[PDB]
Design a protein around this ligand. Sequence first.
Ligand SMILES: Cc1cc2c(cc1C)N(C[C@H](O)[C@H](O)[C@H](O)COP(=O)(O)OP(=O)(O)OC[C@H]1O[C@@H](n3cnc4c(N)ncnc43)[C@H](O)[C@@H]1O)c1[nH]c(=O)[nH]c(=O)c1N2
Ligand SMILES: Cc1cc2nc3c(=O)[nH]c(=O)nc-3n(C[C@H](O)[C@H](O)[C@H](O)COP(=O)(O)OP(=O)(O)OC[C@H]3O[C@@H](n4cnc5c(N)ncnc54)[C@H](O)[C@@H]3O)c2cc1C
Ligand SMILES: [N+]
Ligand SMILES: [N+]
Lengths: 365, 363
Amino acid sequence: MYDYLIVGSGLFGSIFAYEATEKGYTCLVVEQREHIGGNCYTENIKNINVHKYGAHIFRTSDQNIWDYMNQFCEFNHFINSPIAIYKDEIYNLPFNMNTFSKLWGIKTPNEARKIIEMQKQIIQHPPKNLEEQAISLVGTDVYEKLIKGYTEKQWGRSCKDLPASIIRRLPVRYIYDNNYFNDPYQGIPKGGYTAIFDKMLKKSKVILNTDFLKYKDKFKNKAKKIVFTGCIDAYYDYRYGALEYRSLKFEHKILNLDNFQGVAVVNYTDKEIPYTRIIEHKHFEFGNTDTTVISEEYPLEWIKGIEPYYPINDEKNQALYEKYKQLAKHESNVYFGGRLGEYRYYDMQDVVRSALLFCKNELKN
Amino acid sequence: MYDYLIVGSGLFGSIFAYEATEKGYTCLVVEQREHIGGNCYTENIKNINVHKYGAHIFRTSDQNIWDYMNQFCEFNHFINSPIAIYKDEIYNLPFNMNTFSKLWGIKTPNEARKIIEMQKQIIQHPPKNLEEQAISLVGTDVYEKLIKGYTEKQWGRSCKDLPASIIRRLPVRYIYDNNYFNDPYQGIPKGGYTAIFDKMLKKSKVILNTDFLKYKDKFKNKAKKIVFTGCIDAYYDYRYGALEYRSLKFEHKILNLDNFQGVAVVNYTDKEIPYTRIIEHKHFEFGNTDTTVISEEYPLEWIKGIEPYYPINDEKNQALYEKYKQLAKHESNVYFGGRLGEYRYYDMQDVVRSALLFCKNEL
Ligand SMILES: Cc1cc2c(cc1C)N(C[C@H](O)[C@H](O)[C@H](O)COP(=O)(O)OP(=O)(O)OC[C@H]1O[C@@H](n3cnc4c(N)ncnc43)[C@H](O)[C@@H]1O)c1[nH]c(=O)[nH]c(=O)c1N2
Ligand SMILES: Cc1cc2nc3c(=O)[nH]c(=O)nc-3n(C[C@H](O)[C@H](O)[C@H](O)COP(=O)(O)OP(=O)(O)OC[C@H]3O[C@@H](n4cnc5c(N)ncnc54)[C@H](O)[C@@H]3O)c2cc1C
Ligand SMILES: [N+]
Ligand SMILES: [N+]
């Protein structure tokens, strides 16, 4: 019998596993996939660390969190500066002067601001939908070329058919600066993410290719306490219904050339282009090989049983989640954590913070 | 047509079978297993009588019961004195001065009593769980070393997530004495338990490898009365649901050495070790052979259909049993007995007393 049974070997489960075993507790980690790491998992393909479940760029404003992850790796100086392709046009992300000079053929911050403000102001009443919402935030030109088609692919319907709540803010900076994240600490682990999980899970017993739910009673009996980082609704047999998600599908391709797109991340904002993004993984670690691996990111219509990527978090799903959470609060020695256990989108720094806080309260002697 | 159809050849079934045949009644015994004896069954393996379904040590304070079993066998003078292994440590059971001197490095009865009674007092309220219940009775040290891990494995969860009712009492004696049982009569039948059942069932027709419920039609009106020692809920097709049990799995191993652990019963009381006990069977009859048969005893998850070892006997299941008991009181010419027929843990002596009392009223 173990001290802890941990379901899932992602960032939350692995950090807890590491912290618990460092304090002398025994941990059994049960993982359904054929590998560890969760959605942060990287696979070495043709000497390139491939972000299998989408681009993962670590960033934080918390030095303690940054220092924590540095125990397991060294971060390079990768700066995310994504490119957006719209039909035959190409723009810099995030919305900055590089974007604005290209869009309108202007040069000064005042020129850009004048156009942004005049275009935002065509909306003179509270937005009735997502289209009016986005326009009220950044104006028509930015919306049509950089937001509209991309969003309609992600959601599978017109922005006029979508609620305004989906986009709360759209930051604009009047500086020539393509730095996507404003955080002081940013980078990619040298050697990939998976090696971090190897270190975290070294003192744990890890079982792969095993769905905990297919052996629920068997595994519960193997430990005194359970940390579940899978879907909370799935743990409770979806008895109240499945918490709604949006999904994705990645098509990975090995290409016989050294440099496909010249940047790690390219957004395709035209609705007629089926993929939302193309990821060229070698640029994450400044790779110098004669071949490259790219991943085409496709929206995938979600239903129960399909990979849960982005939680919806609307009112009805939050109400549903609170019902499951109430079940959880009354099940002693079973704890739910992570993006799936708490039905929320966690940045990596957010789950590190969440995991460590749980560790501080849970782990004693 | 037989006088009696007896389902099960365990202690209850076999005693009734003996008494009935002795008084000139015809008895048909239907047993689902490949052999007789029920859970008391011993198998001769490498000239060692192996207790196949767990260590079975007969004991009683009733001379009558003891004298009754002596009709079928002779008991040796085996004294049960289990050893408890916790991590790198080793202790004597039951809780006595040998235990206490090892635990605390003390020597006198009063030195031990002072510690135990001081440690017991950290629980000032009614125990909210099994952990507090154990601690309230024997203190933290005894609980952590000899009860905690052992219990966690048996139930698959922490003791503070278990009800206090699981442990009724934990006797403590301030004497240097490793005698596990306080009974004046105790021992192991020479030649094994199976030989006893052989004698009891000699005048009965015995059918093996036959699940009565599975083939109930094949035994329609083949006897006037039925004595059922199987599960009472199973007899009634689980009309109200299944009575809950805990189960066990034994891994029997043969080793080429004369003495594996130097005692019949070793309890493993830390949760890390998967088995709860290791039984070295040759010590029950003071074996002298050059090989030994041991059995690792594992707690096994119970669902409906799994071998029923220990009844839960909580409120939910007692309410369930009472429903089935009421059905039985209206079932003409059918009687239920034994641990399974009555959903109760019985010592062997209890079954003998129970069987004979039924024989008194029926025969
Ligand atoms: C498309 C996309 C892209 C990114 C990101 C998310 C998404 C959806 N993230 C967020 C990042 O992925 C996230 O922080 C972690 O996955 C969270 O770690 P967890 O342990 O919470 O879950 P995660 O989903 O990683 O791990 C859960 C694990 O549990 C397992 N599991 C589930 N059910 C099971 C079962 N029944 N039995 C056994 N195992 C089971 C799963 O297989 C999985 O391994 C990110 N963050 C950031 O800071 N920068 C970034 O660039 C990105 N990019
Ligand atoms: C692990 C363990 C350790 C024990 N240790 C001791 C001990 O040290 N000392 C002690 O005094 N007692 C001990 N006991 C108690 C003890 O074994 C009982 O007293 C004894 O088993 C009771 O006999 P019984 O006939 O009532 O039940 P059983 O012995 O189980 O007899 C029942 C028989 O009926 C059969 N049966 C069930 N269903 C059907 C069916 N549908 N068709 C045909 N046959 C069926 C079974 O196969 C079985 O053969 C222990 C019990 C266990 C479980
Ligand atoms: N406990
Ligand atoms: N233990």
